[PDB]
């Protein structure tokens, strides 16, 4: 039987990978980091409260100008916020109200969203007509589209619930690159700062590092015990952190190809919806199901602070590109800005 | 106050956007959200044409009441990752064929379509997001089941069934077996209706169940409930 021989070879390869990871690990991040000063207590106050959504807010994204926001809720409305003045720049009515992701273009020209309609809809913000119209609708996913991220005005990577990540060409609307290999539904997505690689967290308790220009998985990261719902690169692009339903955040390194540190507490038992990093990467912000965001010392696994003030589950997180503020969205139809 | 002309005009635009958002929310608050569920293509389509590829939107108005019925068919993924989106629906319309008690699902060996429907109903009814959400259970294809129960007994489906091979007793037994999967009888109600291929009063049953759910909601507002 060739199938049993190939299963034995796959088991041998997995054991070789595990042995190479074990032999390459000598001193953990705790053992080197325990000799530096902690960050103390990180206290943040709600500076703005963005009201106007009427259903559970499922996603958000910050602008690269660190002032403009976009948020998605089950109202069927994509509201673009001026976070400095608490002003609604745009309100985009959606064809499908079951939106679970939204992205904002780095140029600021476009907004994507997607959800249970299996379609990433690109919206042209800066039109000659003065309204926000659909640029195009990207179809081809057979499952719910769980995350989308703009590379530029013409390239976008969309995570989806068909156990498949996909890279699209917005000029043609065609499936440029298909990323396959995940067993469970892919729930999160995060682009590298140079947009050369990206990581995806799925429901197979695994994270995979893909290359955009070759379209095939480089490394696979395991260690979680439940469905990964959040993922985010470290700011230099050489590491990333995940968040799953087992109330643990794990930090993984691309070069070491290992898990470095678990950010978990005994008093936290609920799942993690959103994971975001600060500008320096020293603080890891994670949104949980117990209605608040916990700031973690990303180098020491210490609870640096708690961002409490949401009446329902914190579903989405976002730190501005200048690191000035963190914005938490939640199921109680509110967005809050913190400093 | 300490605002420019463009700042004041942007604030005015934001207030207009807030006004349109409030009107849209008030329009959507009077609509009835229904989640349509069932094990495969069993009776969803006949029910849909009786009132009227990702999620399917079905819009119909009955007695000056607008209904939003969502079909999550062909969403072949983990249900728990998107079933919390329908936490605030008015009721769940669960469609079950009565004639597939002896048919096989053909996806798994020795798998019954009826038992797959029981397992899906057990997962949906006792879900954490549907603790207080009522279920309008529809038992599709009663005439086909009535004419085929003479040829094939129900004991091949339920080994512990010892009643007569009649339509009424076995149909009541199937309804009781589906209602026994509700472990939250103190906080939710299951409405069961038997529907034929061409049955006109299906909408009225949905309207009555939705009206009972709306009465339950109305009471809470007065605190009375």
């Amino acid at each position, epitope marked *: 039987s060739e199938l049993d021989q190939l299963r034995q070879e796959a088991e041998q390869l997995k054991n070789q990978i595990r042995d190479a990871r074990k032999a390459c690990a000598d001193a953990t991040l705790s053992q080197i980091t325990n000799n530096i000063d902690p960050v103390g207590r990180i206290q943040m106050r709600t500076r703005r409260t963005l009201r106007g959504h009427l259903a559970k807010i499922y996603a958000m994204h910050w602008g690269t100008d660190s*002032r*403009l926001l976009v948020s998605a809720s089950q109202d069927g409305k994509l509201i673009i916020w*001026d976070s400095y*003045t608490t*002003n609604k*720049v*745009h309100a985009i009515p959606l064809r499908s109200s079951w939106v679970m992701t939204c992205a904002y273009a780095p140029s*600021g020209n476009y907004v994507a969203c997607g959800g249970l309609d299996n379609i990433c809809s690109i919206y042209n913000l800066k039109t*000659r*007509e*003065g*309204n926000v119209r659909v640029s195009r609708e990207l179809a081809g996913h057979t499952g719910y589209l769980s995350c989308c991220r703009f590379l530029d005005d013409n390239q976008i990577v969309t995570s989806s619930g068909d156990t498949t990540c996909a890279l699209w060409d917005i000029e043609t609307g065609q499936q440029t690159t298909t990323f396959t290999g995940h067993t469970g539904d892919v729930m999160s997505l995060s682009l590298a700062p140079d947009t050369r690689l990206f990581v995806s967290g799925a429901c197979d308790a695994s994270a995979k590092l893909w290359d955009v220009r070759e379209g095939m998985c480089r490394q696979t990261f395991t260690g979680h015990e439940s469905d990964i719902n959040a993922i985010c690169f470290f700011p230099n692009g050489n590491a990333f952190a995940t968040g799953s339903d087992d109330a643990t955040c794990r930090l993984f390194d691309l070069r070491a190809d290992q898990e470095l540190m678990t950010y978990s507490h005994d008093n936290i038992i609920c799942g993690i919806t959103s994971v975001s990093f600060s500008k320096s990467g020293r603080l890891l912000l994670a949104g949980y199901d117990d209605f608040n965001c916990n700031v973690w010392d990303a180098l020491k696994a210490d609870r640096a602070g708690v961002l409490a003030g949401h009446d329902n589950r914190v579903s989405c997180l976002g730190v501005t590109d200048d690191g000035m503020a963190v914005a938490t969205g939640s199921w109680d139809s509110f967005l809050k800005i913190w400093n | 106050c*300490t605002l*420019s*002309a*463009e*700042d*004041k*005009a*942007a604030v*005015e*635009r934001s207030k*207009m956007i807030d006004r349109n958002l409030r009107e849209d929310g008030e329009k959507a608050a009077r609509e009835v959200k229904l989640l349509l569920l069932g094990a495969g293509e069993s009776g969803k389509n006949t029910i849909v044409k009786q009132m009227k590829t990702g999620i399917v939107e079905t819009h119909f108005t009955f007695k000056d009441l607008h209904f939003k019925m969502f079909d999550v068919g062909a969403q072949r993924s983990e249900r728990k990752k998107w079933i919390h989106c329908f936490e605030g629906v008015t009721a769940i319309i669960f469609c079950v064929a009565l004639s597939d008690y002896d048919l096989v699902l053909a996806e798994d060996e020795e798998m019954n379509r009826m038992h797959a429907s029981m397992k899906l109903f057990d997962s949906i009814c006792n879900n954490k997001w549907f603790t207080d959400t009522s279920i309008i259970l529809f038992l599709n294809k009663k005439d086909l089941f009535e004419e085929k129960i003479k040829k094939s007994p129900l004991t091949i489906c339920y080994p512990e069934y010892a009643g007569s091979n009649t339509y009424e007793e076995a149909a009541a037994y199937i309804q009781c077996q589906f209602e026994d999967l509700n472990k939250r009888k103190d906080t939710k109600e299951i409405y069961t209706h038997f529907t034929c291929s061409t049955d006109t009063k299906n909408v009225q049953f949905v309207f009555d169940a939705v009206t009972d759910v709306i009465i339950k909601n109305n009471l809470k507002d007065c605190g009375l409930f």
Partner: single-chain antibody
Amino acid sequence: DVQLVESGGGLVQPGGSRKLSCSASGFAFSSFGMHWVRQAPEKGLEWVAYISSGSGTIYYADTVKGRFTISRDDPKNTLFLQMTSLRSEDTAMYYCVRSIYYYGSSPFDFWGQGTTLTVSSGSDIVMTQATSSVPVTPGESVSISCRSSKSLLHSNGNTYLYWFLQRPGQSPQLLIYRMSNLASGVPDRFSGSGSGTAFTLTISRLEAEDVGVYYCMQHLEYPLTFGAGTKLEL
């Protein structure tokens, strides 16, 4: 395409009443605030009236306030300027101007072709241009300077300075909308700069396509005041 067509102009006896219409097509008329800007035969842009989106805010120039009436009907995309008691100084070519206001928006971006109406026979921000007409060689850089009585820099960091170019026999177009921001469809050879009350507009590698009268307008506070107009010749 975005188009604004004006109508209703003509010869009017003094003290008469006429109504101007501005039919809008090719854009979402309801979401745009709308301005009336007239230009007398002496070649000077003058702001007349403004109506916001939703008709919630209406402003008038001090010379037409209580005597002109601006209104819009968003169902049919028409802007109205009901004028009563017309005197000889109202003889001007009235432009219907399109302007939207949000963060990063470009107001005064589209101007209509204008309708010509003929009448027979203190605290404002003064906008000053030192040069009224200068000759320029094509292919060479030119600078148009503008000054303001009040500082146009606001507390929010925006300097509300607008640059308009009006070619001969054409409606004015927007070039720079906040003292540095290049407009849409205008070449990168137009650049604006300045600080406080001193302003400049640089046109490197000038062509015959740039020949016209250049106006500086402030949008810090109403009424909106234009410059005298710097004309480029040769």
